[PDB]
Design a binder for this molecule. Structure first.
Ligand SMILES: *[C@@H]1O[C@H](CO)[C@@H](O[C@@H]2O[C@H](CO)[C@@H](O)[C@H](O)[C@H]2NC(C)=O)[C@H](O)[C@H]1NC(C)=O
Ligand SMILES: *[C@@H]1O[C@H](CO)[C@@H](O[C@@H]2O[C@H](CO)[C@@H](O)[C@H](O)[C@H]2NC(C)=O)[C@H](O)[C@H]1NC(C)=O
Ligand SMILES: *[C@@H]1O[C@H](CO)[C@@H](O[C@@H]2O[C@H](CO)[C@@H](O)[C@H](O)[C@H]2NC(C)=O)[C@H](O)[C@H]1NC(C)=O
Ligand SMILES: *[C@@H]1O[C@H](CO)[C@@H](O[C@@H]2O[C@H](CO)[C@@H](O)[C@H](O)[C@H]2NC(C)=O)[C@H](O)[C@H]1NC(C)=O
Ligand SMILES: *[C@@H]1O[C@H](CO)[C@@H](O[C@@H]2O[C@H](CO)[C@@H](O)[C@H](O)[C@H]2NC(C)=O)[C@H](O)[C@H]1NC(C)=O
Lengths: 353, 353, 353, 353, 353
């Protein structure tokens, strides 16, 4: 029954005592802010610069003793999004940020609801490039935790205290998949605090859990390396008399192992601690290098026989045959038990982390 | 007959009851928005980050009971584009966005038309970087669907409902070609809806269909691999006595197949599910590896004959000749039937998707 | 004799009837805009994303029946560049754009002149990243045409019509050279038109012509490939008895041809139609592959002779010598006539396009 | 007891004599600014463009004779962050900058405190891309110093003088680690000054110390090179009669050393002075090249014996055996004493810098 | 003695006749602007896109007949940097620009001084990405000249004329070094002019001189190539009987020369004119190719002897020995005189440019 313009002008205006630069219920208890997180599109995680791009909606609810009309017959009112510089929006920033621009397509992407009691709604979609300090102890499994710290800036703990919600904590979009990782539906959340030299500031956070969807690294690194140890066993199944071919084969296998190994760490950023992949590459490289060394020893034994050329002649030839046959038998069992030990210790550490 | 300035000042002014912060025909039925899409320049699709750049014009028409002059002798009026903060433009955003800036060259790229009844026009060219979740089950064919979701932000389903148009749905520019794909002239379109925890919001979308213009991947991957299996058949047409040359040829072919294979997946982003190209590379690699293995077996048989050096001698030589000739015959027929089976199953799946 | 401030305040002010939001000589004939283009710095053309960066000055002249003082003793007046929001600048955009920011260093880069009759001047330097749909039928020659479409946005053909100039059409900077291309001094220009669903809009364009300054591609691709066919002729001038060396040489040449070929298309964006360079690479690859095949055939003939080891013995040896000598003679003449045919068909198509 | 709005309006208003465009206690002594630095997230250092990204909080305190209410019962007051254009914030810039944008997420990231005496607080989080002129005399150790120069712009030394703090100088975040370097807890700090042609300006700086967390460069460069000298010693443990194999092995090792060496300097920017890594690569390359040269000399001696083929025959064979055995003994001791000398001179220079 | 606010309000205000939109001493002589350049941080020159990043301070002084208080006892006054839209700053732009943003960290980076006579100061730090058309006739020496053209925009030669200074022309920062180049302390400067179709505009410029600090290109390109010609001389010091090894060595050296050569031009942008480095690579490639050719000729001579196998036999063997020994002697003297001729013509052209 009353004109909409008149109601809007009177409320949050200059003819009333509403001042947008001061905290409501001044000089008393702090105001509680209830935040909810709707993840719109997770993805584009950078593993070389330790960051990821995510756009949240950041809806926050609080109560004020003012702006309580209590005269309209409905429960809540929808206000226009171009009158947000008089609603006293609270302060909120992220402790790990890079850029973090707004969204201004067609019209401003703000929202502002107001009810009879004073519980408001304020959600703004913002694209964040949050930096996460991921620890990469083992590269193939790569269990990871990503955070974000909602924290005030200029309002202490005894001035403004933030809180989470109970009906739903962190919501995700329906049908949201990632090509690198998969999202865990546990959504571990708690909150820390900050102690600077100016006062005690609140800082609420939330943790995510992302594990690697295996199958890429098996074809890029594990499958080619296997085709190299089989190549060295192929060098074991060849005639000893021929010097050119064998030598070339051993050398070529070693070179490929080095190139591959190198190229495997290119995507990864410079790190000091040895990785799981490095251990695998070193073991393979050792096997191929050992094969080459075994050939040099056999060649030397045969050469010694040639230089000294009855019973010792046959003994040397027999020794060369025996070492080659025992190397052909011994090499796949040690590699198979290394493969079994390696995958069983990494599957139990994948279950344990 | 009446002064233009006076008419402009009176309409959408402060001496009248027009308030730009409130929805027209308040507390009643919702207002319908009729949207049209003119694609100006499609292209620059990113296959490694799953996005594409497109600039639409976004013309939207709606009706209001106000701004109905009904006193000028013409049907419609052209207003200046610097008076858009009083025309109550509705809210519209895209659910998949990255950046999405405006266009401000020379003068603002807005448009605003107004007729006697109140049907307005509002088109703004905006460059969008829309993220599309493309599924790459088979890489060479790469059938793809790209979308965009027009959705309100702050107006529920019972407050503002969007709709499409009937005279033309999504228009494209005349003579618009893409180097990677080709545009399908079907333009499949329908609309979903959104259900958040704050209310029911409308969400209108449109789907495109882009198929790969084949001919690039045939020269980059298929043509070189063929020149590798012919190389292994060349190794089959060589004398068995010579150990260096053959060994080197087999090894070299295998190495090229691995390098090529690796480099072929560099453009593609990290994915878990095996691709069609990977299957082709594996089959080729297997053929060349098998050739190498066949040579090792022949070499071993010949060596056995050498170590034991009448009727068994001839039998061993005959066996070596027989295995080489049957391998030279058997290898191109298995590769030819694999090529026929591979291309016929991919052409029937290209017709089926 | 009259105060400058008073004259400025009265003209394009609120005490006069000048309204900046309305077109001059309203409800009558359209106003003609005379545009000139001064290219400041052409360059930075992107061949992988089909675009180029150019900064024009965009001076445009038009006439209005208002702003005709006719009281100062000079012909024209220079106004300050911070009073451009009251001069009714017309609308102009480009149909192919990416970014296209302004220039704001020290002071605004605008210009505004006004004469006694009303012919104004308005030039603004803007850096444009225009997208051009270049067709690359033949890569080395790469004849190209680049455009830019000046078009209004909100003013129809019967409301505002653009035109070019007659004293000079498109000016270039003195001493402007490009490292990739060279500018043609013809400057072909004409104008198209646009027909959308809202009305008939004017669209004026201009075409440039850029041809490749040859000498880069001759050293990067043509010179190394020649040094590969000479390498295969070197393999032809070697003894047939030696199996290792020859085989290795043939294989190595083939591998280099493949690597080179691959790497040559890296700069170029993904395209479907076969290029001129690809044809050259294929022909060279065929020659080297053929050489390898020729060796395998000779080796096989010699091996047959070895297995059967009087008159047929000499005949086989003679045949091996004859095939090698005829291959050594036949191979440079076919390659020389291919080189002559290839360069004469590309020089006549370079003269014809 | 007094209304908050009235107090805010009167203070830093137009009804009082507070002018925000003039320095407090004008025409007298300069005002001292006490700055503190809280490092929020150090990291993303660029070693190829000599820069690093760091976000500081920049809290600065100063005193003014105005804004001394002395009427509220508390010690300090918290003001709103949207009234900062009337508090006369001082001027501060950085002498080495690239970009250096602000932070505007949800609400402005400013802070403003005011006490009864007039000591204010003003902290703003700003992401800085500071350029540091790092000297890379030795690449593996890479001891580095990073700075930042806080300096005024428009206020001379006798007008505004900056100072540091005594209770804490430069604070770091709790649990801040870097993947490339490690932060030194000394935090060396002092201050320089500037003398331009316009006056004497103050310039306060702070220096950091970052040393390389070793373990990356040991696996990427040192470990593969060792596996190359062992490869050349493998070539020393092979029969001299065989010419193909040995030659190939020597050549292959030399080629890998060159490729590796090249690729090792790719990350590093173009520099003129020789690096420590280059010295190591050159020494290794020399050892492998020397091995190859040793083989050529032995081959030549054996060939001479072949061409001349009693007592000199045996003497030549004996000489070939003696040179090979003495090269097999002499080569690992010279490489081991080079390794000992190299690591002991670099560990004493790592302790000395 | 007079209030600072009153003086500031009266001067450059609306109660006086000062108009910021008009040139001082109107309709008379032009105003002279004295510019000085302080280079803060030179560096980050791009050799592939022909540009460089430099931040200047751009202090400019001019005189006006207005703003002459002549009532304060000091010589000059310091004004606040937030009142620059009323001081009539002149127009200045750069003819070669890319981006060229401002600097806004903490407070605006402007400066404004005003004396009793009217000589003002105005310095603004701006980061410029100036495009320079460098000519690369010889790549290792790479003598270069970089410019920047200060020019007005909207004020003709008879309206506003710019000038340089006499006490210092272009100042550099103390201790400013570059990793790629070194700065010449000559600072050649003069000024051109512009003649467009609208009038005569002033354009003042300054030229820098940057020469290459040699030592990078000697290790990346010159040192590896030498280790390739020594490798071909190693192939000359080997036994002719062995066909595999030699052939492989020749081929490998040629391949490395090609790969290296290619990779050397990767950093450089596409250019047509042959470079000095290309000439060096071609000469080296020719020497290694020639060595390979020499071997083929010797092999052919030996083969001819084998096919014909008394006095001609010895003569052929003697000829093979003579050609090998004369090639081993002749090859290092031609390469040494080429090295001497090459470095003496480039050191005299380095002294001449
Ligand atoms: C939400 O705010 C209310 C007041 O605005 C807080 O209630 C006060 O909390 C303190 C600490 O427990 C008590 O000493 C007061 O007596 C409470 N006030 C009243 C009126 O009961 C409340 O703690 C806040 N909620 C949370 C979760 O902290
Ligand atoms: C366009 O808007 C009109 C009203 O503005 C809608 O018409 C109403 O629709 C509801 C639902 O069907 C009916 O119950 C009402 O009776 C309609 N009003 C009238 C006056 O007839 C209409 O539905 C909208 N168009 C679309 C496609 O939804
Ligand atoms: C420039 O504008 C004038 C009017 O502003 C145009 O002149 C009119 O053109 C139409 C079409 O030929 C004629 O029917 C009218 O009679 C013309 N008016 C007058 C007063 O002669 C003119 O065509 C425009 N110039 C161009 C090149 O289109
Ligand atoms: C802080 O500021 C005060 C004044 O605002 C400075 O005190 C003056 O310093 C000069 C130089 O030593 C003396 O000659 C004056 O007598 C001092 N004034 C008074 C009232 O004592 C002080 O130096 C500044 N602090 C620092 C560290 O420079
Ligand atoms: C600086 O400006 C003054 C005037 O503002 C210029 O002086 C005039 O120059 C012209 C050309 O030489 C003479 O014809 C006038 O007579 C000069 N005026 C006076 C009052 O002497 C002066 O040329 C400018 N400086 C420079 C270097 O051009």
């Amino acid at each position: 029954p009353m004109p909409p313009s008149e109601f809007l002008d009177k409320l949050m205006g200059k003819v009333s005592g509403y001042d947008a630069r001061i905290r409501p219920n001044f000089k008393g208890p702090p105001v509680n802010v209830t935040c909810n997180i709707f993840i719109n599109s997770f993805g584009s995680i950078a593993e070389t610069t330790m960051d990821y791009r995510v756009n949240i909606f950041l809806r926050q609810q609080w109560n004020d003793p003012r702006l309580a009309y209590s005269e309209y017959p409905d429960d809540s009112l929808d206000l226009d999004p171009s009158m947000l510089d008089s609603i006293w929006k609270p302060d909120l920033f992220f402790a790990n940020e890079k850029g973090a621009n707004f969204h201004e397509v067609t019209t401003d992407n703000k929202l502002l609801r107001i009810s009879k009691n004073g519980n408001v709604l304020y959600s703004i979609r913002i694209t964040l490039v949050l930096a996460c300090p991921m620890d990469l102890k083992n590269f193939p499994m790569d269990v990871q935790t990503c955070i974000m710290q909602l924290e005030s800036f200029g309002y202490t703990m005894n001035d403004l205290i933030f809180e989470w919600d109970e009906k739903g904590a962190v919501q995700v979009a329906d049908g949201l998949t990632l090509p690198q990782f998969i999202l865990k539906e546990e959504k571990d959340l708690r909150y820390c605090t900050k102690h600077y030299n100016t006062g005690k500031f609140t800082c609420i956070e939330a943790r995510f859990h992302l594990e690697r969807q295996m199958g890429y690294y098996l074809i890029q690194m594990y499958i080619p390396s296997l085709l190299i140890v089989i190549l060295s066993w192929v060098s074991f199944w060849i005639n000893m008399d021929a010097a050119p071919a064998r030598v070339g084969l051993g050398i070529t296998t070693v070179l490929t192992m080095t190139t591959q190994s190198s190229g495997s760490r290119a995507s990864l950023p410079k790190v000091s601690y040895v990785k799981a992949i490095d251990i695998w590459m070193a073991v393979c490289l050792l096997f191929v290098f050992s094969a080459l060394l075994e050939y040099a020893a056999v060649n030397f034994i045969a050469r010694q026989h040639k230089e000294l050329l009855e019973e010792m002649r046959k003994l040397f030839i027999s020794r060369a045959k025996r070492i080659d046959t025992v190397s052909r038998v011994a090499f796949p069992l040690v590699f198979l038990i290394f493969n079994i030990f390696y995958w069983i210790t990494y599957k139990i550490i994948r279950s344990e982390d």
